[PDB]
Amino acid sequence: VRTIKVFTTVDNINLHTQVVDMSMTYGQQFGPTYLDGADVTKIKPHNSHEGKTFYVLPNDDTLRVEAFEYYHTTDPSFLGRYMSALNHTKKWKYPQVNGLTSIKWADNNSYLATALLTLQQIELKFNPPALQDAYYRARAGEAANFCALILAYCNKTVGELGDVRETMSYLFQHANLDSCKRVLNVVCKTCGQQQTTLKGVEAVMYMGTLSYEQFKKGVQIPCTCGKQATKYLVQQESPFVMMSAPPAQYELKHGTFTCASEYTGNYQCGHYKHITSKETLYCIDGALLTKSSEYKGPITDVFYKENSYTTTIK
Numbered sequence: 001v002r003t004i005k006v007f008t009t010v011d012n013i014n015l016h017t018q019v020v021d022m023s024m025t026y027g028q029q030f031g032p033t034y035l036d037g038a039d040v041t042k043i044k045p046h047n048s049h050e051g052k053t054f055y056v057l058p059n060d061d062t063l064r065v066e067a068f069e070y071y072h073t074t075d076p077s078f079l080g081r082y083m084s085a086l087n088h089t090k091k092w093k094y095p096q097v098n099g100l101t102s103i104k105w106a107d108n109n110s111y112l113a114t115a116l117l118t119l120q121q122i123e124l125k126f127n128p129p130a131l132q133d134a135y136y137r138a139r140a141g142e143a144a145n146f147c148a149l150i151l152a153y154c155n156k157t158v159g160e161l162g163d164v165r166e167t168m169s170y171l172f173q174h175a176n177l178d179s180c181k182r183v184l185n186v187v188c189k190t191c192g193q194q195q196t197t198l199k200g201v202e203a204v205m206y207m208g209t210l211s212y213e214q215f216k217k218g219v220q221i222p223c224t225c226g227k228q229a230t231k232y233l234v235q236q237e238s239p240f241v242m243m244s245a246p247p248a249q250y251e252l253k254h255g256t257f258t259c260a261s262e263y264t265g266n267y268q269c270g271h272y273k274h275i276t277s278k279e280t281l282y283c284i285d286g287a288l289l290t291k292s293s294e295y296k297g298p299i300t301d302v303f304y305k306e307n308s309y310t311t312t313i314k
């Protein structure tokens, strides 16, 4: 009977000593097992494996609590989905484009590229230690762990078309936005005025207009009485705002926004590109970079810097 001593983990922080029989697969001993992002479930232990660290699924209460503390998820499938994705994202390339970490196109990953580029231009902290640690490495240019985590957190597999707005919405749940506040007014010349306060994620995301300025001036929306009402921003407290709308032709003006997402295509097949406002407008398309003084195209999300805004509408 031939054995080696190894370490298992769910987080690569807390290691647990184990002895494995070299005649049985890791599968038969630990369940699904991963070594440096590779599935070794069906592999037998090799001499060169001795002393190494393997990821396993949280199959007991110690591993479940360690996974909950590192990833801030209780979902039992999470670590499986993360390791599956990491096998592919380890093989992506992460070039520096215009001073930001991007992703070279692969596996329909344009939505992840524009999300990563966006996160580098807005003030945001992730609460799960896994996610903040991976985020800092991604900013430095080693984004494989961070992209695999985004996929695992969003219940998306490598190769599946994604939606930037949906992705941001899931990541923002894991971010420190609790103190973000939005107050808005809806005014009907008949029904009167109705105020609404939002907190957290709901305070920094809007679906229906790309224009922050328009939101501040008032946008027309229907009233239940048949009149058109005006909805406007009363007060905003957040480090940014994300304004989203179904894709349509839209002009982006240098110096009026931080960055934006463009989407070409449909629900079967499509492509995101990132537009950022620096000294001029840059289009970051995975590894590709183009500049222009103007830009017009099918924008679906725009991001704006903020701290504290109050209306002067009486």
Ligand SMILES: O=C(Nc1ccccc1)c1ccccc1[SeH]
Pocket (backbone or CB within 6 Å): 273, 283, 290, 292, 294, 295, 296, 297
């Ligand atoms: O969109 C682009 N230019 C552009 C410039 C003015 C109006 C509309 C469009 C572009 C050119 C080359 C590569 C990528 C892009 Se997004």
Ligand SMILES: [Cl-]
Pocket (backbone or CB within 6 Å): 210, 211, 212, 213, 214, 256
């Ligand atoms: Cl605006």
Ligand code: NA
Pocket (backbone or CB within 6 Å): 119, 120, 121, 122, 123, 124, 125
């Ligand atoms: Na950030």
Ligand SMILES: [Zn+2]
Pocket (backbone or CB within 6 Å): 188, 189, 190, 191, 192, 223, 224, 225, 226, 227, 229
């Ligand atoms: Zn009304």
